[PDB]
Amino acid sequence: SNVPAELKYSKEHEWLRKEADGTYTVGITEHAQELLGDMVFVDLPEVGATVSAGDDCAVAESVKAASDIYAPVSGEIVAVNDALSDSPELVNSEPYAGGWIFKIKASDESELESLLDATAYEALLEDE
Amino acid sequence: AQQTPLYEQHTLCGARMVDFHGWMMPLHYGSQIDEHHAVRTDAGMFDVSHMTIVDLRGSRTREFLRYLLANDVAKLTKSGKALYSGMLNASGGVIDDLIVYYFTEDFFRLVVNSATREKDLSWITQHAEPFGIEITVRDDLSMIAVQGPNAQAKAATLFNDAQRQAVEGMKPFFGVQAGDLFIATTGYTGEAGYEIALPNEKAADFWRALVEAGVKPCGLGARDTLRLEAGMNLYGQEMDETISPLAANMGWTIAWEPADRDFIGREALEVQREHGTEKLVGLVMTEKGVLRNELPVRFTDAQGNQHEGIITSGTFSPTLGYSIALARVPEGIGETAIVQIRNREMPVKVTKPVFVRNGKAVA
């Protein structure tokens, strides 16, 4: 539930799911969304944008504040969640499903190789 | 940071606590937008126990309050009648806004903000003294605000027969003691409902029974978006000791008549009314984004001259589906303005300082 088994994780508090075509679907974790509160807008990057790990490339707006969402890995943005324009509350209700933010074609295997796993992640919320 | 007697009930209801002016209070219980929706469509409730309640007794009470306050308690002529008022300093700035309830010629009650408790108590005990008023700080009481179109019906399922009798037919802005409940038709959301004050030791259980009656727990998040939609001020943002009420859309609360009632600040106010003041307006931003506190608001008069006000409160309105704000602006503003967000200039519509009235967008 709170941390699905099959996912990779950043810190950041983002998740990544490897798609069948080798790209990664990225969104924020239940813990990230809980800390955000109800999302009212999200500003998505441009499809075709190149990012480096650590770039701020999307913004979630809640009732209380704006907050940056950072690239978990280096790569090219291949898709963005256009459902979030009408239904931004999907980040809150379905952070691992309907609430995904973007998709990335990763350009660097070593970054991928240091992403946290369901276990290393549950150790990070639990750590503090 | 302190806490209310309800701290436990809040966490049992899933509250996310934050520090609010030295009290741990619920920001929300899961979703502020849902909490806001509940108040607008059904029944929601807020722990308002951190507000200070002051009882004032003695034959000089009415006289004293006619001097302390800028509205005029002589308007209160029916048992239990309440009004809203500012309490000004000698320069006509606002020390606090508050609600006063009239009980008997010799018994009134004030309810003031939490952030302003110490300053107000000192101001009140300072000026009351020569009137010989018996001043009681009611920290022995908690208070729950129950708000929404079914709030009064849900709350009343907890009232015994005498309490139901006491409140039946009760119009807006009245308060009544009925046994150990004080029930008042006051609120900060723009909806009908009650505020109920009762002993601290009974408050946990009343909250529990209210939950069980179908009233949704609502936190500070929703408290802010409801009050802002309703056009209601938040002390420290819409006004403070440097801001005149007539610049904070509280002109309507100043009881100028009878002219022979002097009150603290009246003389300075009279002078300000004559020199003119800035004014509080509503901002509506239909384009994507959210207006935030203290952002500059700019407009250009017919002549090509730029002028600048400030946002006092900004939020997203879940009832409008758009960001709204209150802002203090020079006179002569027109229909539109521009607000600086990040480093881009966002058009806004300028409106009356109220967004939702008797249920709907007042568009």
Ligand SMILES: CN1c2c(nc(N)[nH]c2=O)NC[C@@H]1CNc1ccc(C(=O)N[C@@H](CCC(=O)O)C(=O)O)cc1
């Ligand atoms: C948090 N506040 C508050 C309180 N006292 C009580 N009992 N409840 C409160 O929520 N005192 C301090 C501050 C009061 N601020 C306000 C602001 C607006 C209104 C209000 O109802 N304004 C109506 C006035 C209508 C009338 O006067 O009949 C409005 O329509 O704007 C009340 C208190």
